[PDB]
Design a protein around this nucleic acid. Sequence first.
DNA 1: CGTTCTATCTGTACTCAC
DNA 2: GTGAGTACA
DNA 3: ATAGAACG
Length: 175
Amino acid sequence: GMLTLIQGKKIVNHLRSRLAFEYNGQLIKILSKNIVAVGSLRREEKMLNDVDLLIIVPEKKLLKHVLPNIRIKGLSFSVKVCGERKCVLFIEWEKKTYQLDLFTALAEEKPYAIFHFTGPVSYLIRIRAALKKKNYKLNQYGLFKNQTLVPLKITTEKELIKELGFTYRIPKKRL
DNA sequence: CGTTCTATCTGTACTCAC
DNA sequence: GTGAGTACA
DNA sequence: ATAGAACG
Ligand SMILES: Nc1nc2c(ncn2[C@H]2C[C@H](O)[C@@H](COP(=O)(O)OP(=O)(O)OP(=O)(O)O)O2)c(=O)[nH]1
Ligand SMILES: [Mn+2]
Ligand SMILES: [Mn+2]
């Protein structure tokens, strides 16, 4: 069911202090600095088809556990699909049902994953096609050339975009 | 030779063979 | 266990 | 962003 930008932000704000995962007995809280709003919400589209959240996980050992044992305090939801990297929930928010999409990235993948999950799709396609012509492959995990991770000296998304030789635009204006 | 239109990526989760 | 086909991020 | 194709 479709939702407004404002509704999207209220939901994300509510989830931001309430996400956790079960890890061998212990309930472990997910920190706010590891929750990044992505998709059309980040791009500030007036109407959203869903809410898209990227979760930064500190260790590779945790991937088996975070999404598959995801917990949301005081909220009822069902699980449509769930793996280590993509989880789709249907959540009850103020008597209505909405789609929440959760994705995981490792610290070293962060800027690549924010770039990828921010979209929009058409932007990603043209950017990736251009890199492909110069014999590179870009995905949510990194920049690859001949199946080898290229070690870029970069922390943020903005640094990545510039490093790739493309114009930086705020998410609202990417196309 | 300029204008305008067109096309283009990459990977995850689930199901169902065999 | 692996590969193909679908749906969808 | 880039480059090819149709059109002028
Ligand atoms: N490379 C790539 N990335 C995608 C694709 N589909 C989705 N994504 C990424 C970029 C999107 O902004 C992000 C979320 O996808 P959604 O389908 O939720 O679309 P988005 O939120 O942009 O709009 P919407 O949900 O319809 O309001 O995931 C795809 O086909 N290819
Ligand atoms: Mn979305
Ligand atoms: Mn989504």
